[PDB]
Design a binder for this molecule. Structure first.
Ligand SMILES: NS(=O)(=O)c1cc(-c2nnn[nH]2)c(NCc2cccs2)cc1Cl
Ligand SMILES: [Zn+2]
Length: 258
C-alpha cells in the first residue's frame, strides 16, 4: 500500500508515512505574482548545459526520468539565489489528464498542463544522497508547459515513451540536449521548499521560470499514454502525477524581474 496519486494513496495520505508532508517548507506553492517581491540583489542565473551527457530514460512508476552523467561538472546551474555549483542529475515532468491541470506550482491559482523539473545537487556535499539531507542541497529549475505549438526539442523524448510504457522499463537515451527545453527568458521566481514527492525532504531551492514553453496537444497526449503499472498488470494511465499547492507559511517568494 505504497504512496502514489490514486484515490486511496494520493497526496492527502502521504503524511501518514511522511509526517514532514505538513512541514514548514513544503512544495509546491501558489505563486501570487502581486505578493512576490523583486529582489534586485539576485545575481543573474547561469544555465550551462552545452556539455550535458544524457544516459537513460526510466519509467519509475509515477513519472519518467531522463538521467545524466553527473560524475563531473558538465551540466551545471549557478547564480540567481544559489551559492556555489549545482550539477544536473535528471529531469522529469508532472502532467494532467486534461490541459487545464498538471502543473505543481500555480501562478495566481492558474494551473498549467504540465511542469518540467530539472533537478540539480550542490557539489559541496559530494553526492546526491548527502545533498538531500541539507537545507541547500538541491536546486530545481521548474518550467511550465502550455498546449499550443510543438516544442521541437521535446520530440526525441515523446518518441521514446512507447519503449518505457510501464513501471521499471528503461531505454538508452544518449546525446539529448536539455537546452532545447528552455524558454527564451530566464526571468524567475525563487523560494525555499521541498521535494514534491515522498520523502518530501526540505532540501530544495526552487527556481520557477516565468515564461512557459509551448508543447503540442499530440506531445502531451503521448505523456498520457504511459502507465503507472508494471508490465502484465491492469492498465492505469500515468496522468495527474502532481501534488497540489501547499501552505506558504513563513516564506517569501522573490522575483528576479520588475
Ligand atoms: N518533483 S521534485 O521535487 O523535483 C523531485 C522529484 C524526484 C523524483 N521523484 N521521483 N523520482 N525522482 C527527485 N529525484 C532525484 C533523483 C532521481 C534518481 C536519482 S536522484 C528529486 C526531486 Cl527534487
Ligand atoms: Zn518533480
Amino acid at each position: 500500500h505504497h504512496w502514489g496519486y490514486g484515490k486511496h494513496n494520493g497526496p492527502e495520505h502521504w503524511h501518514k508515512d511522511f509526517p514532514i508532508a505538513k512541514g514548514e517548507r513544503q512544495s509546491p506553492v501558489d505563486i501570487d505574482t502581486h505578493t512576490a517581491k523583486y529582489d534586485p540583489s539576485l545575481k543573474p542565473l547561469s544555465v550551462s548545459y552545452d556539455q550535458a551527457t544524457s544516459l537513460r530514460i526510466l519509467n519509475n512508476g509515477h513519472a519518467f526520468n531522463v538521467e545524466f552523467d553527473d560524475s563531473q561538472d558538465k551540466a551545471v546551474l549557478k547564480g540567481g539565489p544559489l551559492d556555489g555549483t549545482y550539477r544536473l542529475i535528471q529531469f522529469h515532468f508532472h502532467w494532467g489528464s486534461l490541459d487545464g491541470q498538471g502543473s505543481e506550482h500555480t501562478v495566481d491559482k492558474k494551473k498549467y498542463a504540465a511542469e518540467l523539473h530539472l533537478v540539480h545537487w550542490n557539489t559541496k556535499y559530494g553526492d546526491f544522497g548527502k545533498a538531500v539531507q541539507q537545507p541547500d542541497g538541491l536546486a530545481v529549475l521548474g518550467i511550465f508547459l502550455k498546449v499550443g505549438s510543438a516544442k521541437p526539442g521535446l520530440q526525441k523524448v515523446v518518441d521514446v515513451l512507447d519503449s518505457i510504457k510501464t513501471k521499471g522499463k528503461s531505454a538508452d537515451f544518449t546525446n539529448f540536449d536539455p537546452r532545447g527545453l528552455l524558454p527564451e527568458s530566464l526571468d524567475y521566481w525563487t523560494y525555499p521548499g521541498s521535494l514534491t514527492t515522498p520523502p518530501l525532504l526540505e532540501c530544495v531551492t526552487w527556481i520557477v521560470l516565468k515564461e512557459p514553453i509551448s508543447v503540442s496537444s499530440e506531445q502531451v497526449l503521448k505523456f498520457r499514454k504511459l502507465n503507472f503499472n508494471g508490465e502484465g498488470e491492469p492498465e492505469e494511465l500515468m496522468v495527474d502525477n502532481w501534488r497540489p499547492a501547499q501552505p506558504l507559511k513563513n516564506r517569501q517568494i522573490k522575483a528576479s524581474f520588475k
